[PDB]
Design a protein around this ligand. Structure first.
Ligand SMILES: [Mg+2]
Ligand SMILES: [Mg+2]
Ligand SMILES: [Mg+2]
Ligand SMILES: [Mg+2]
Lengths: 125, 196, 195, 226, 232, 204, 212, 222, 195, 196
């Protein structure tokens, strides 16, 4: 199998592949989160360079991970689907084994863990 | 067990090894397997020791009572009594018996009674676990109307080979000679027959 | 597990399941709920080998809930029953098969029709107006064959169900400690708390 | 089932009956038991019918690829070696018992093969439940230097012995003749000694005899235009 | 219930225009050991009947003694014992069939398959089979054990139905029987070369042939057979 | 215990003049218990018809498997699969489970769309093909069907005459089998029309 | 097999199916499962056909000898006990019997005894025996009253066998009905299940699950 | 271990007419895949206008027929040469069979004749003696192939009158002796085609007020 | 059959026996009386294999009635129990043993004492203050060990018996359809018709 | 089956009967049980026909590949390859093989490999079901350094007796002679060896 170390340290102690991934995030449409006293609001930018779009069927920017937790993102759209699927599977797995839905912190910790893993595993970006 | 009986010019000779085993243990290394049911009618026993001793004792009784009433029984008659016990009780017996005897009218005769209780009159007969290994040798070397010395040699050589290959056979080679002259017992020790 | 019954009437599906759990010599519990909600308008009752029943039911529940979240859509009762059948058909040629029989009661919101599916541990599926597993059908089907009408109300269905349970309580040797009854219709799933 | 193989002057002939059974019931009355491994290598199968067909087609497929790879016409010894090593590996669980015959550049050949993977050579062979009936005929009439006509006669007579005497065999005789320097000639239903007699009565019903609840047209056509 | 110990293999037979023929080899097997080589398995009863027996030899010798006793018993107080009141093949068979069925019904069978061959008083051919189960049947040709599978097909080519019997001479019938015995020697592992053959004819009576051998054997073709596939 | 007789049921197929017929009962049971009277055992993929008897879970699984495979066939071949070709596909698919088989008795029926020739075939549970000219039978009353078909069948029957023959073969065979009945369906198949008829029969 | 018998105001109703099977093969659809022991006593066939036929005919002979000797009709209690004591002697040997001995005498009134090959003898009001017994019990239990008319009781017995015949694979063929009075039993005909099912479906409105 | 039972194959068929009765059977006798005989009679005239066949294990079959023939002989001796009626013969055979309830005759027995009103009669027995009067009964190897055909062609089962569509049954009109023999021959011809144990020959015994007549027909020998 | 219980109080013996008769799949009867009066002051309840139970009980009844007529005297409960034990001890080494367990409740008119004997099918006899057969003791003995007093009244005995039956109805898997209760005292044998 | 191999002055000779049985039926009466694994290394096969054919084919392959790399293999080497297959697969094989070969350095050699997969180098060896009946005869009649004609007679007489008593043995007696001069096939028919 393809084992090449793509994420490595540079002489100044930087991992450029991780830093270049942040540059992809910088390019993505803007997302914002604000929590009130009894709510949280997620706002997302839609670039109007694409009209003749069918808004009924086009992938929406905010995704339900469970009935009580949502996830929005900035960056590569295709990449986000992989994280969303993994998070949704883990949410159901947690309900199955702990008999309680995930806390927001736990779900965050899981997604963040997947992202870290892809920074020191061979053959992946 | 290795047993045989062979007719010859002057009569018949019975031969046997002396080994009795319980599994791989030799319970008796000097067994006498040549048993007398009448003066000049003897038998070689193979199979269950309990069964063949029981059968032989009953036959000896039958022939003793026959003799008191009708005089000396023929070898055919003795074989018939053996057969009757073996055939009718075939479900409950494990016995393979060779019957050998000397008449003056019929001379030397040999009858073999295998497991099922059938009877077969033969010039010579071999039986027991050791006999399997000497079917070839005996068929090639047996002649009719041999002398006493030739027949002793034939049996000595035959049972020597049976003992050599069969773990259930061994010890001394016992023989009983049946002729007009009488009844002679012979014994041959390992140091003799092993060098043949 | 023991008795599980189902009946599809005009506008709903009713599932009745026994409350007893017996481990050999003693009845360990008399309030056991032998059912799992797979989606808001789909209920599954189950019976079979100890352990495997709850393990299979919760596994199916987890999978349907996952589909619901992924697509933001409730699968039809027919689609759920087909998914369940395949899982049992797969299981029967496994190293250690799930020994679990199920009834799936669902209300199809698209067709506005109640639907009842009976599936055994081999993966044998049939759609029925009424069904059962084990010996339950042997005592109840002659009553259902006589009284059942496709235009029955929910109340009439419950009354016919009571007659079935009464016949079971009379002629069955085992004490199954009554039944929990649940109704599936256009408004979802609810439990009848007095039966 | 009765199957035989017979060597002759300039080749080999194979024959078989045409009855296949499930227990005591006759499933098919005109079954084809002579199978083609390659144009001039044919075999007849006894035992599990699916296994005899499947193992024939698998080795036949691989034999064809081997022939194309080597630019040579397939050999009977190759079919034999491939069959036996396949069967041995499955330790008798593939219930194929075959008589393999054919001609190739090396000459004419006749072999038998058993389910566990053992093979044998011979001038005359028989297999199946009617093999003892067939072998009785073969042992009575076989001689060295048979002609083509004599071998066909002997083979079909041996199958007839199975047909009439073995309950597992019946109906017709199929024959295939493989001669050196010639096309193999497959003679399907070479003999037909078991045609059913006319029945005493016609059992055609009057129209409307069967009670019908519902009628409907079944749409076998695809979704239509317009 | 028992098991056969010393055993005899096939008995084969057929009808011809003027009588019947029956044959069986002279071996007594002890499993795979070919133990006894001079066993007569065809037993004549009078001058009109021959009984051929396969299976357990100890039981055969018992049946032989029963038949011997039957002849003795029939002669008792019977002035026509060698004439009108002689034992018929049909009488001998029915007696044996009765004994065989009775023994199986006590779960203690005589482990045999038996063919009774003979000619009746009116000249009619008699040929009928009985076995350890008491099963009986008649046919223009009859055979036991391996003979049923290999001899019958050959013998049925000569006499296929009842109407073939008057067209079959004694020379053609004996020829067919002798050939069948050769085929059995080729193919039965518990057979021997030595056999007996008996002919019962309505004109010439009972002809009993001992010490017959299988001859005209084909073995020469074996020299060309090499290996089991690829060996040259 | 015997997987091929847990659920019960039968299928029969016949050839006629420029036509074929395939028929089945409607029962599904759990041994003695009748469970369903609407369990149809005949399916079709284009103009090719497949009847399946045996273990009901395998009947459903194989229908789904052959729908799967004939759909991919059509997308790649750009034409509907023919009866002769489909027969080989069934045989191949069954043999691939040689040592863990589907407990079924499939039956194929159809007319080749190019030659117009009527075609039928049968299989054992592991794939052996029976290609009869006259008729094919399958299921828990296969003995009864063999008896009916052997006496009732004659070659070159017109479509409406073939309907009567196959219907009477099924009905009377099913009435001598405990695990078959509870309704019946007959398909009459011509080159470009197929008629489906549900029969009235005893319900015990 | 499905057989039933029940006590009511007007006596006893006996109803049976007509099917015999050997495995899946239907051997007969015309089996007589009510044994007419004598003009006053009936017995039902379940388990072994021969064991029931033979020993209940034999029972008729013993009943006839009793009334010749005692100059009085045998009681149902005594008749049933002659059979149960007989089969108890054979216990272990492999007899197969499950029967209802039915009669109506002066001293007892309508009486039913369930007699069985392991020696059981039970007096009761309603009994059902056979592979389809559970289906018939359902219809019986929910519709039974002591004060049923002869007409309604006959129909209830007919309807209960039909229920079993429909669902039980090994029950069917036809229904045989009997009504046992004090003056003897009265036969109420043979009813083909095929024809009966459609007739009952239409007139009653039952079996909506079945298309007709 | 010794098995006291065997299977000799064979198929038999009894049909009762209005004033006649036929009992037919194939003449082939077999064990396993071998043929013992192509002509071994299986249906027997037992006297008093009664014909009998006990199909299955032939040793038990021959024993039973032999014991019944004997019972007819002793019935004449004990009851002033009174004719044994078919119903009385049937009850007597039950007792012969049940006498070996715990070691049964491994056979399926059928008898045929005329009842005391001159009407055709057939009785059928299981191995341990259960019996019934019947109109139509096949026995033995190919019984499952023959009975459904007879249900359809003798009793007109599943046949309705054209035009009524299931409302009116086909009326059960009486069949002649020629008509019954046609159905018997076609039954055995079809059974011969599909069952390996059926073949060689067909022997039919016909019973009327005039007595017992025999007819023989060839069947395929493969 | 199934549950048979016994308790000996101050002045009487009380026997409780279930009413159900089950033949495999169905409950054939729910009013069966599993007892026989052997003499005016001696009662025997029974449970075991079908047929043999009633056959054995009626056989014992016939024998004790015969003794009563011959001697014009009622045997003591101890003497009756010894006769019954010997019959079962004889039976256990027979060709086909009686598979029957019994309780014998009697009032001894000579000693003015109630007596309860428990005998199983092997012929194992013990005199007890309270007893049972089968699984009945497993559920009831802990209650009897706690509450039992030798000076209890008949009414107190019935109340303790009700508590035992209630525990059986709770924890036993089989529905035994209640019990018939009978009291044996100086005045003879009577049935409690409401329990 | 009756098989044997005997070393003599000029090399070694292999002998065998030609009978192959399925129960009591002779499935082949003209079988060739003497199989070539190399030019002058042959073997006699007993046990499962499928197993011994499979083993022999694998050995022939191994020795063909050995020869291409290292030149002519010794008889010991051939025996070792046979042993490796028989020992390591003892749970799944029923094979009793005698290996015989001629070297110029070692001359005639015989190795027997019984059921368990052990190896035993012997002056001569006997195997198969028929061998049991000739242990006595062979032990009495074998001499070292016999001539070709004497060794042919020894094998012919030995297998004659094995065939006579063993029902599983019969047909023709095949022989293969291995010497410096080459490889010679011999065949002897029933009419010849039955009269010995
Ligand atoms: Mg049916
Ligand atoms: Mg039914
Ligand atoms: Mg046939
Ligand atoms: Mg030999």
């Amino acid at each position: 199998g393809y084992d090449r170390a793509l994420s490595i340290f540079s002489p100044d102690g930087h991992i450029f592949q991780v830093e270049y991934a942040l540059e992809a995030v910088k390019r993505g449409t803007c997302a914002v989160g604000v929590k009130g006293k009894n709510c949280v609001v997620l706002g997302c930018e839609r670039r109007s360079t694409l009209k003749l779009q069918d808004t009924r069927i086009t992938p929406s920017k905010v995704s339900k991970i469970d009935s009580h937790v949502v996830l929005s993102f900035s960056g590569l759209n295709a990449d986000s689907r992989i994280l969303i699927e993994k998070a949704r599977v883990e949410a159901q797995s947690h309900r199955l084994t702990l008999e309680d839905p995930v806390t927001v912190e736990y779900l965050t910790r899981y997604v963040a863990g997947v992202q870290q893993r892809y920074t020191q595993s061979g053959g992946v970006r | 067990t290795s047993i045989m009986a062979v007719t010859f010019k002057d009569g018949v000779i019975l031969g046997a090894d002396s080994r009795t085993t319980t599994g791989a243990y030799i319970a008796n290394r000097v067994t006498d397997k040549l048993t007398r049911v009448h003066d000049k009618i003897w038998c070689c026993r193979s199979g269950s020791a309990a069964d063949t001793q029981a059968i032989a004792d009953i036959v000896q009784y039958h022939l003793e009572l026959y003799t008191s009433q009708y005089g000396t029984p023929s070898t055919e008659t003795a074989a018939s009594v053996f057969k009757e016990l073996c055939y009718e009780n075939k479900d409950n017996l494990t016995a393979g018996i060779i019957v050998a005897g000397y008449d003056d009218k019929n001379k030397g005769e040999v009858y073999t009674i295998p497991l099922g209780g059938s009877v077969h009159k033969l010039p010579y007969a071999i039986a027991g676990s050791g006999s399997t290994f000497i079917y070839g040798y005996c068929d090639k070397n047996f002649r009719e109307n041999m002398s006493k010395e030739e027949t002793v040699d034939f049996i000595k050589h035959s049972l020597s080979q049976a003992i050599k290959w069969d773990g259930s056979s061994g010890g001394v080679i016992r023989m009983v000679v049946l002729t007009a002259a009488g009844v002679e017992r012979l014994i041959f020790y390992p140091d003799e027959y092993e060098q043949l | 597990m023991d008795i599980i019954l189902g009946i599809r009437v005009q506008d709903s599906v009713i599932l009745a399941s026994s409350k007893a759990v017996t481990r050999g010599i003693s009845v360990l519990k008399d309030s056991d709920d032998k059912t799992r909600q797979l989606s808001p308008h789909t209920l599954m009752s189950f019976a079979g080998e100890a352990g495997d029943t709850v393990q299979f039911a919760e596994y199916i529940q987890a999978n349907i809930q996952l589909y619901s979240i992924r697509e933001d859509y409730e699968l039809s009762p027919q689609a759920v029953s087909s998914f369940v059948r395949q899982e049992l058909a797969k299981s029967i040629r496994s190293r250690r098969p799930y020994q679990v029989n199920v009834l799936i009661g669902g209300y199809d919101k698209k067709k506005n029709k109640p639907e009842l599916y009976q599936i055994d541990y081999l993966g044998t599926k049939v759609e029925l107006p009424y069904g059962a597993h084990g010996y339950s059908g042997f005592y109840t089907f002659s009553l259902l064959d006589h009284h059942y009408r496709p235009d029955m109300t929910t109340e009439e269905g419950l009354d016919l169900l009571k007659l079935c349970v009464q016949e079971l309580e009379k002629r069955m040797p085992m004490d199954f400690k009554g039944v929990i009854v649940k109704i599936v219709d256009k408004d979802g799933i609810r439990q009848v708390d007095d039966f | 089932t009765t199957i035989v193989g017979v060597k002759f002057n300039n080749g080999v002939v194979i024959a078989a009956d045409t009855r296949s059974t499930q227990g005591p019931i006759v499933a098919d009355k005109n079954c084809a038991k002579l199978h083609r491994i390659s144009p001039k290598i044919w075999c007849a199968g006894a035992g599990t019918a699916a296994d005899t067909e499947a193992v024939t087609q698998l080795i036949g497929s691989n034999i064809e690829l081997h022939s194309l790879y080597t630019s040579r016409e397939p050999r009977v010894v190759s079919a034999l070696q491939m069959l036996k090593q396949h069967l041995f590996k499955y330790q008798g669980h593939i219930g194929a018992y075959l008589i393999v015959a054919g001609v190739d550049p090396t000459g004419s050949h006749l072999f038998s093969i058993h389910a566990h993977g053992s093979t044998d050579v011979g001038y005359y062979l028989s297999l199946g439940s009617g093999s003892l009936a067939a072998m009785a005929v073969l042992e009575s009439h076989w001689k060295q230097d048979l002609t083509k006509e004599e071998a066909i006669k002997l083979a079909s007579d041996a199958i007839q012995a199975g047909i009439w005497n073995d309950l597992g065999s019946g109906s017709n005789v199929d024959v295939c003749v493989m001669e050196i320097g010639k096309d193999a000639e497959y003679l399907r239903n070479y003999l037909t000694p078991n045609v059913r007699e006319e029945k005493q009565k016609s059992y055609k019903f009057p129209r409307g005899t069967t009670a019908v609840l519902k009628e409907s047209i079944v749409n076998i056509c695809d979704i239509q235009e317009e | 219930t028992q098991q056969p110990i010393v055993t005899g293999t096939s008995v084969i037979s057929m009808k011809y225009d003027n009588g019947v023929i029956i044959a069986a080899d002279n071996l007594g097997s002890y499993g795979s050991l070919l133990r006894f080589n001079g066993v007569e398995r065809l037993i004549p009863v009078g001058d009109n009947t021959v009984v051929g027996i396969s299976g357990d030899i100890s039981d055969m010798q018992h049946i032989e003694r029963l038949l011997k006793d039957l002849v003795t018993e029939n002669a008792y107080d019977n002035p026509l014992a060698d004439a009108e009141e002689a034992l018929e093949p049909s009488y001998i068979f029915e007696y044996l069939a009765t004994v065989m069925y009775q023994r199986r019904s006590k779960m203690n069978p005589l482990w045999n398959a038996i063919i009774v061959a003979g000619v009746q008083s009116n000249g009619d051919q008699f040929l009928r089979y009985v076995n350890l189960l008491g099963v009986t049947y008649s046919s223009p040709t009859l055979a036991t054990g391996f003979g049923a599978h290999m001899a019958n097909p050959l013998l049925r080519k000569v006499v296929d139905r009842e109407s073939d019997i008057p067209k079959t001479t004694v020379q053609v019938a004996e020829e067919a029987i002798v050939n069948a015995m050769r085929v059995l020697y080729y193919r039965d592992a518990r057979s021997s070369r030595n056999f007996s053959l008996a002919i019962i004819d309505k004109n010439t009576g009972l002809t009993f042939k001992k010490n017959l051998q299988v001859e005209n054997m084909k073995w020469d073709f074996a020299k060309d057979i090499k290996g089991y596939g690829t060996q040259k | 215990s015997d997987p091929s007789s847990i659920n019960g049921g039968i299928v029969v197929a016949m050839t006629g003049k420029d036509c074929v017929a395939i028929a089945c009962d409607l029962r599904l049971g759990s041994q003695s218990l009748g469970v369903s009277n609407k369990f149809e055992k005949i399916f079709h993929y284009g103009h090719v018809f497949l009847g399946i008897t045996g273990l009901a879970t395998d009947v459903t699984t194989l229908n789904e498997m052959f729908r799967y495979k004939t759909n991919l066939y059509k997308l790649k071949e750009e034409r509907a699969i023919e009866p002769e070709t489909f027969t080989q596909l069934v045989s191949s698919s069954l043999y691939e489970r040689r040592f863990g088989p589907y407990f079924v008795g499939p039956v194929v029926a159809g007319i080749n769309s190019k030659s117009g020739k009527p075609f039928i075939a049968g299989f054992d549970l592991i794939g052996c093909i029976d290609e009869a000219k006259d008729f094919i039978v399958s299921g828990t009353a296969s003995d009864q069907l063999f008896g009916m078909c052997e006496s009732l069948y004659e070659p070159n029957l017109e479509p409406e005459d073939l309907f009567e023959t196959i219907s009477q073969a099924l009905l009377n065979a099913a009435d001598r089998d405990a695990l078959s009945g509870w309704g019946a369906v007959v398909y009459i198949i011509k080159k470009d029309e197929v008629v489906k008829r549900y029969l009235k029969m005893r319900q015990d | 097999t499905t057989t039933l018998a029940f006590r009511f105001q007007g006596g006893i109703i006996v109803a049976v199916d007509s099917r015999a099977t050997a495995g899946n093969w239907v051997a007969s659809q015309t089996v007589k499962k009510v044994i007419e022991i004598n003009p006053f006593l009936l017995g039902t066939m379940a388990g072994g056909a021969a064991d029931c036929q033979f020993w209940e005919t034999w029972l008729g002979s013993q009943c006839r000898l009793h009334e010749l000797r005692e100059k009085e009709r045998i009681s149902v209690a005594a008749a049933s006990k002659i059979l149960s004591n007989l089969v108890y002697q054979y216990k272990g040997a492999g007899l197969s019997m499950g029967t209802m001995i039915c009669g109506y005498t002066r001293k007892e009134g309508p009486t039913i005894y369930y007699v069985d090959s392991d020696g059981t003898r039970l007096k009761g009001d309603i009994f059902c025996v056979g592979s389809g017994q559970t289906f018939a019990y359902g219809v019986l239990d929910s519709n039974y009253k002591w004060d049923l008319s002869v007409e309604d009781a006959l129909y209830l017995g007919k309807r209960s066998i039909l229920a079993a015949a429909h669902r039980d694979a090994y029950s069917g063929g036809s229904v045989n009905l009997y009504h046992v009075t004090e003056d003897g039993w009265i036969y109420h005909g043979n009813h083909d299940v095929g024809e009966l099912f459609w007739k009952v479906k239409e007139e009653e409105g039952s079996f909506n699950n079945v298309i007709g | 271990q010794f098995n006291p039972y065997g299977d000799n194959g064979g198929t038999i068929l009894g049909i009762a007419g209005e004033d006649f009765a036929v009992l037919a059977g194939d003449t082939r006798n077999i064990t396993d895949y071998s043929i013992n005989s192509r002509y071994e009679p299986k249906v027997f005239d037992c006297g008093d206008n009664i014909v009998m066949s006990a199909n299955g294990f032939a040793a038990d079959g021959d024993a039973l027929v032999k014991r019944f023939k004997n019972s007819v002989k002793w019935y004449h001796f004990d009851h002033n040469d009174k004719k044994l009626s078919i119903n009385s013969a049937a009850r007597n055979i039950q007792h012969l069979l049940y006498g070996k309830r715990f070691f049964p005759y491994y056979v399926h027995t059928i008898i045929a004749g005329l009842d005391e009103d001159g009407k055709g009669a057939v009785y059928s027995f299981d191995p341990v003696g259960s019996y019934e009067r019947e109109q139509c009964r096949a026995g033995g190897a190919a019984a499952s192939l023959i009975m459904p055909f007879l249900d359809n062609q003798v009793n007109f089962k599943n046949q309705y009158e054209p035009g009524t569509n299931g409302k009116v049954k086909k009326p059960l009109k009486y069949l002649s002796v020629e008509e019954v023999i046609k159905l018997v021959r076609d039954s055995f011809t079809s059974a011969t085609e599909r069952h390996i144990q059926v073949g060689d020959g067909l022997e039919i015994l016909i019973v009327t007020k005039d007595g017992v007549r025999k007819e023989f027909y060839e069947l395929k020998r493969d």
